[PDB]
Design a protein around this nucleic acid. Structure first.
Lengths: 104, 167, 190, 206, 244, 134
RNA sequence: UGUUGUCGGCCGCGCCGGCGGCCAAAGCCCGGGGGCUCCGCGCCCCCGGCAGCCGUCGUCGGCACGGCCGGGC
RNA sequence: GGAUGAACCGGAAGCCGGGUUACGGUGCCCAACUGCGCGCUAACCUAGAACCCACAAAGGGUGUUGGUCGAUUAAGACAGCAGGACGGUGGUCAUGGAAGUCGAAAUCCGCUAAGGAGUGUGUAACAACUCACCUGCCGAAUCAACUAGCCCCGAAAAUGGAUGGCGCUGAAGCGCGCGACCCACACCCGGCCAUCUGGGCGCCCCGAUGAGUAGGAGGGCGCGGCGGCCAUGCAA
RNA sequence: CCACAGGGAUUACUGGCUUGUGGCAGCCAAGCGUUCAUAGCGACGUUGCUUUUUGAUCCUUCGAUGUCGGCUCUUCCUAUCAUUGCGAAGCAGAAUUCACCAAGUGUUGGAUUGUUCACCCACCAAUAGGGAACGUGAGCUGGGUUUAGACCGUCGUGAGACAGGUUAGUUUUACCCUACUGAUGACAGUGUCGCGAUAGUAAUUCAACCUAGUACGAGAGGAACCGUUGAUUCACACAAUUGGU
RNA sequence: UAGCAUGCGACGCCGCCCGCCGCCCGCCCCCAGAGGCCCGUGCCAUUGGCGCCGGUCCGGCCGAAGUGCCGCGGUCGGCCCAACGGGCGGUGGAAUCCUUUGCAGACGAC
């Protein structure tokens, strides 16, 4: 049909953001450090390089900023390789938007 | 079978009623459904349709299903049928090729929907009738399958089968 | 939707060879060559031993597919007949007061009609394929158009007749032209 | 399932040959929004499903609309297949916002090949056409069959398509003749290949 | 209706619009006659300057109507058309972005003509020895560079065009001394022969007599007289409005 | 594609998904032109309407009609077809599976070492090219 | 003053397993009879012993993770 | 949520935080499925609960699918092609004239294996050819009729094209089932503000409900001069 | 003769809704057309579409939407009057009659009347209809309507009144924004020559000759295609000539 | 007819430039009906003996621009800063105005 070869692709999947570092004086850009709870398999991190993490910016749920901004980054590289990974965000995030569950 | 299609529910019952020498007398009318949730409802359509009762002047004794009846295996079901389209309900006598009682409903719901146009509110059918393979009368898919059982023709359309990849 | 389908096979006659490549078929016999493309749904077109059998087959069928297969078989029969036996349409000039003078320009392969209905401007249209026109004048009556390819011969025949149409008054009134007198044809010795 | 065309950190070349125009545009708009810099190549060879007359009327209602009503300045209509694809992208992206306009400006559509992007173009995960006009399934129309009925840029584009295809066919034919030679001396030196203790556990993982 | 009523063709054309300043003072052709005749002896255009108008008597020709055979007046524009220097051969490529020039081969002699070409054209009015135009290479080092350019050009099949200019000091009535630069396409037979003839035509001047025959049908291209700014009646041909 | 659909035996088919979580199957009983019963020797039988389950090239040697014992016998006769199956056409998954098993120490040293040698082979291969070349 | 590990509470998650409900049963092997098709294959149905394992209700049993908030022995 | 939208849907809101959901939605714009099993449509139908807002009728349609019933079939059909039809008697009426063939009786049989007082073409009228029935060639289904779906048709308007847009077509339409997901301030959960339940020592604590114009009822902030108390001021 | 407070809580009035009325269409087809439902004509009945007449409503404005008609100037629709290509005929030619596709270009000049509308006259290929706030007053015009003066008729005791007629009876503003027409005009390594994504549209129609006093036709009359000439209308341009200044 | 502000080409190219490099300071962050250093000290990192890749001299093919790649013979090298830049430094090779006018023109422009 689809000719399943395929690959797999599944949404799962939650993770948490450890903390986002926005630094300058003027040489560095920005870092975000990410922890998926268990997930991607050593094979499925490795085969890949290239996770998109899309997190909805959903009311969470006092009155939140409910906006039509869903943000999706890309995972650069493991640093943590059997767990934790480095990530970057391209728009830049919401407020202190550290914490909130990360998903694909 | 996996995520239903319509297991027929054998409801034996009553009609439990009054201090007069009367009482209602016995029925099944054997109805195809998904478990009790359809039954309860199924009875009020049977009770409105045939006898007129109430809701309360139907009482239900027990329910028995049917458990893989057919063993996977086969018949091309004759169905006597009602479809609601551009007015009320019109009769149809459909005899179609299928697997089973699970499949017959869907092939009817899809053919009453496409073929007959039917949209939601609709209730089901009147009956479903096994028949023998040589007997199956009218028309296209089933006639070919009847011929396949004959055989020669299990072994015809392998003749596309084995003719996608190549020999 | 569905329904279902099967193979049809045609014997090739001894005076005809066939060769198939891609979905183009070439049919060749002593009246000449004919090359046509049979692209269609789920449907393959092949020569099962050249000099034996042309096969058309498909693994999928419906009322539309069966119509296309029926057109395809008529086209191949038509090709087989054209390469051994030829096609002819035979066509007659009619003029009811003004002599119409029709002839062939072999260079720029075309048939040109002068003094059509008193028209100063010559009417011409080509000849498609290696179709041949003979004008066997006599009074200046009979035109015979012969070829292997029916499609291209017929377009050429239809075109000569088409060349004469006038639509401006009176379907009844003006019969000046060249009209198809055949359909077309047998083959032959003599 | 995994989308096998999609992310690369930088690439981005897309083959449009007998791909479905709105399906290809949808992934391209998503890659552009992600911050990719997208080059669609072979825009003349891209396909749209549907019967020619009904595709021809849609564009034609724009062509009568090209004329009037008049300041000048736009509403505007592009005759040619890359620019038809660019018109498709400038509806796919939210086309009133700086994030969308900045995504639009990261797209290029090129007709034939530009002068050489000889890193291969890649197919989009089943974007491609054959079936999506289904066998039959009525007509399809190529953008280079649409734009012959709408005009140049097309016409030059299909003449440059022709030359770029003819020369790269010739250059392919001989590079393949040397590649086959290299393959045959490579396979014999894997048939041979010296020995193992560790080494043949890897080809027991093909 | 609505209105009204008594309805008119609309004054002054829309294919002749924008009614606006032309970008440069000297006309520019966007397309040419087709290659259907002799090689690039056929330069596809020539230039002159309009002197005025005069008038002619001719022995005519036609025969269908009443007045015939015989003497007639017909009206004439005189142009001074001095011989014009085809300076260089410009090599245009077909690309799917339009034509692109590749390189240009130059004669040994434009030399007041390029100083005039640097007068609006470029700017500042030519007094003590300036603007500058580059000098030729060492001769046959530069001719082999040029003939290596000819090789690429005459293998890849360039749509041949000519840079030419009017050597204006051959006119008198513009008392002016300045050259006017133009792009003229060269049209003819086969493309290699067309490059060869264009080469043999830049290494010496061309007169009117080598591009147009007497009687020949010529399209003439110019820029109209300027008025300045106007209202609608004398700019689009609309009515005056009447009451006293 | 509308494809292969049918009604015959011998033709192995491979999965375009379901529950199970497996799976490869061959069609035992044939039961119009949509519905068919697919089974396997060491796999569960199912009757599906299965457009979108596609059949592979390699075909196994049986005739029409199979109950369970008969099917088993056929499988025994064949086998070999499963190997083609481990490899190739549909089929593939045992060579792939050999892939997935590998992000693991012992497994990682077997890999550097395939690599290390692979290099020695590149170097020999390269020397050969140099002698061939000029 | 900022951060990170955690113990306790709350909620989410996926996966595995058992028993009873449909007197359990698809089942298969063994054994007996009937029918259709009467061109024979093949199809069907029923009954006893028996590997076997099924889709669904209910219920219980086992694990591993995350988020948020706080600091009974 | 519905493109926008006083009154449609979800929902009734203190503030915040997190979790899960409702309505509705999951090709891109836009988070989240280019989801599964099946079937219909190719018109760009068509992306639509409701709306002045989203039109489409009477009537028609061998488009296509599907259901059914009757009759006809290898005691050979339906169609096509080909082939057989003497005589009573140029059928009785009527009328210039029917005489097979204006109109109207009447439709039998000898002689026969088949062979109707005839199906359409004729000349003023007279002039021939085919055909009922029967047969061959061919070989398999045919015909009649009800019912239903979608589509098609009916279908013309004013500055410029859209179902919100790109715009799809074995779907990104439609219907019948189904799986997983998304998504509010809702609901839960955590911490906290009023009133009230009250409780306990001028103060602390437990739990519930708690948008708001007109507006009632009540606590408080600020202005300016006065008095008693109580200070501040060479930097007010 | 007016004045004041207000109201779009309520009219005239433009707009919006409706669409009975109006315009146009489909269906059915009694019937008429010598015979013939469907060359044409076509009732009753019936379903619609438009929104451009009229009516209805009272949503919008009464701290103000300038009136009718006209003119000029831009643009559009199609239910097409002509022109192109068509089909039918009760199409012999031939004038035509009805209808199909089709909005590119055309669709005029005058006499009465303020008129719109309409009547009339010669023209013409034909002198189509319908929208754009009844397009068009920060353009014009100002004849009607619709102030204050006055007459007549009718009504009223009278002031005064009439969808009754008549003579006279005013047209403000220096453009901030926006719109377009037209001229300027930075960034970028420079001027110039260019390309051409794309944006505007240019040619319309007639008469006559060749053919031919032919075809077709009892006759009377009376065609076509190209091939030729010229001119109506529109566009661009120049100014030797002729004409103005 | 208009049209480099489609964010283009070419031609012609110049009171100090710029061609080629030492040393330092900011921005993004493979090809592909499976594949992609011999002896050593040393926790490291540094740091030393000694076939396959990376700039190079010299040239060709898509290239017709922008733009790239791939080879006969050797040299600096291995088993941070590409696309941009911003300098401390070495070695080495024009136009507006003006004045008078117009084919041009309200000014500006031409």
């Amino acid at each position: 049909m689809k000719g399943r070869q395929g690959q797999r692709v599944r949404l799962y999947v939650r993770g948490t953001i450890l903390g986002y570092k926005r630094s300058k004086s003027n040489q560095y850009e920005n870092t975000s450090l990410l922890q998926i709870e268990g997930v991607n398999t050593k094979e499925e991190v490795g085969w890949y390089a290239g996770k998109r993490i899309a997190y909805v910016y959903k009311a969470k749920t006092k009155s939140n900023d409910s906006t039509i901004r869903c943000i999706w980054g890309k995972v650069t590289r493991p640093h943590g390789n059997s767990g934790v990974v480095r990530a970057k965000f391209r728009s830049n995030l919401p407020p202190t938007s550290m914490g909130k569950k990360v998903r694909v | 079978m996996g995520a239903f299609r319509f297991h027929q529910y054998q409801v034996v019952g009553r009609g439990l009623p009054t201090p007069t020498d009367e009482h209602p007398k016995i029925y099944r009318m054997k109805l195809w459904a998904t478990n009790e949730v359809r039954a309860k409802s199924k009875f009020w359509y049977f009770l409105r349709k045939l006898k007129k009762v109430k809701k309360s002047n139907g009482q239900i004794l027990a329910i028995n299903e049917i458990f893989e009846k057919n063993p996977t295996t086969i018949k091309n079901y004759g169905i006597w049928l009602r479809y609601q389209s551009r007015t009320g309900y019109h009769n149809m006598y459909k005899e179609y090729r299928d697997t089973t009682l699970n499949g017959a409903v869907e092939q009817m719901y899809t053919e009453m929907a496409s073929r007959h146009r039917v949209r939601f509110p609709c209730i089901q059918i009147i009956k479903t009738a096994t028949v023998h393979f040589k007997l199956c009368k009218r028309d296209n898919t089933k006639q070919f399958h009847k011929s396949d059982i004959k055989f020669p023709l299990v072994y015809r359309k392998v003749r596309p089968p084995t003719r996608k990849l190549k020999t | 939707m569905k329904t279902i389908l099967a193979s049809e096979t045609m014997e090739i006659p001894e005076g005809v060879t066939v060769q198939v490549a891609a979905k183009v078929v070439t049919v060749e016999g002593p009246r000449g060559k004919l090359t046509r493309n049979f692209k269609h749904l789920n449907l393959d077109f092949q020569l099962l031993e050249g000099g034996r059998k042309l096969q058309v087959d498909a693994w999928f069928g419906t009322r539309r597919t069966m119509a296309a297969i029926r057109t395809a078989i008529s086209h191949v029969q038509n090709l087989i007949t054209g390469v051994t036996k030829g096609y002819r349409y035979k066509m007659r000039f009619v003029y009811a007061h003004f002599p119409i003078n029709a002839s062939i320009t072999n260079s720029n392969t075309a048939i040109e009609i002068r003094n059509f209905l008193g028209e100063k401007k010559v009417r011409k249209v080509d000849m498609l394929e290696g179709v041949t026109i003979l004008r066997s004048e006599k009074v200046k009556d009979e035109l015979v158009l012969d070829g292997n390819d029916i499609e291209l011969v017929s377009r050429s025949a239809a075109l000569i007749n088409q060349k004469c149409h006038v639509k401006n008054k009176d379907i009844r009134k003006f019969l000046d032209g060249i009209y198809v007198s055949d359909k077309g044809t047998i083959t032959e010795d003599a | 399932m995994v989308s096998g065309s999609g992310v690369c950190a930088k690439r981005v070349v897309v083959d449009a040959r007998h791909h479905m125009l709105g399906r290809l545009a949808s992934i391209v708009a998503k890659e552009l929004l992600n911050g990719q810099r997208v080059v669609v190549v072979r825009c003349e060879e891209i396909c749209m499903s549907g019967g020619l007359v009904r595709q021809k009327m849609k564009y034609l209602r724009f062509l009568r609309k090209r004329m009037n009503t008049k300041p000048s300045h736009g509403p505007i209509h592009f005759r040619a297949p890359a620019k038809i694809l660019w018109r498709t992208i400038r509806g796919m992206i939210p086309h009133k916002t700086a994030r969308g306009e900045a995504a639009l400006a990261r797209l290029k559509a090129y007709e034939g090949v530009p002068p050489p992007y000889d890193r291969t173009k890649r197919m989009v995960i089943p974007d491609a056409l054959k079936v999506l006009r289904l066998q039959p399934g009525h007509r399809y129309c190529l953008l280079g069959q649409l734009s012959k009925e709408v005009g140049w840029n097309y016409a030059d584009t299909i003449r440059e398509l022709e030359e770029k295809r003819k020369e790269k066919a010739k250059v392919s034919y001989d590079r393949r003749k040397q590649l086959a030679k290299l393959r045959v001396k490579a396979e014999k030196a894997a048939e041979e290949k010296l020995g193992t203790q560790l080494e043949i556990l890897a080809p027991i993982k093909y | 209706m609505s209105h009204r009523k008594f309805e008119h063709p609309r004054h002054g054309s829309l294919g002749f619009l924008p009614r606006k300043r032309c970008s440069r003072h000297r006309g520019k052709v966007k397309s040419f006659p087709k290659d259907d005749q002799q090689k690039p002896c056929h330069l596809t255009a020539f230039l002159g300057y309009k002197a005025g108008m005069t008038h002619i008597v001719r022995e005519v020709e036609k025969p269908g109507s009443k007045l015939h055979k015989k003497e007639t007046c017909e009206a004439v524009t005189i142009i001074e058309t001095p011989p014009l220097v085809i300076v260089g051969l410009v090599a245009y490529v077909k690309t799917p972005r339009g034509l692109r020039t590749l390189n240009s081969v130059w004669a040994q002699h434009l030399s007041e003509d390029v100083r005039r070409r640097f007068y609006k054209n470029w700017c500042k009015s030519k007094k003590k020895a300036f603007t500058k135009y580059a000098l030729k290479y060492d001769s046959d080092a530069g001719k082999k560079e040029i003939q290596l350019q000819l090789e690429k050009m005459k293998k890849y099949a360039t749509i041949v065009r000519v840079i030419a200019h009017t050597q204006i000091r051959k006119m008198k009535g513009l008392k002016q001394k300045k050259a006017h630069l133009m792009e003229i396409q060269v049209n003819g037979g086969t493309i290699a022969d067309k490059v060869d003839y264009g080469y043999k035509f830049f290494e010496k001047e061309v007169p009117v007599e080598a591009v147009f025959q007497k009687d020949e049908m010529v399209d003439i291209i110019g820029v109209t007289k300027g008025k300045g700014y106007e209202g609608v009646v004398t700019r689009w041909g609309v009515t005056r409005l009447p009451r006293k | 594609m509308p494809f292969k659909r049918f009604v015959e035996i011998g033709r192995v088919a491979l999965v375009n998904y379901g529950k199970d979580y497996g799976r490869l199957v061959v069609i035992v009983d044939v039961v119009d032109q949509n519905r068919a019963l697919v089974d396997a020797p060491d796999m569960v039988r199912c009757q599906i309407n299965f457009k979108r389950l596609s059949l592979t090239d390699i075909k196994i040697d049986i005739k029409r009609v199979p109950k369970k014992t008969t099917l088993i016998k056929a499988m025994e006769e064949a086998d070999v077809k499963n190997k083609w199956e481990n490899s190739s056409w549909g089929k593939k998954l045992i060579v792939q599976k050999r892939r997935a098993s590998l992000n693991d120490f012992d497994r990682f040293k077997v890999m550097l070492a395939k690599i290390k040698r692979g290099g020695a082979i590149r170097q020999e291969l390269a020397k050969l090219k140099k002698t061939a070349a000029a």
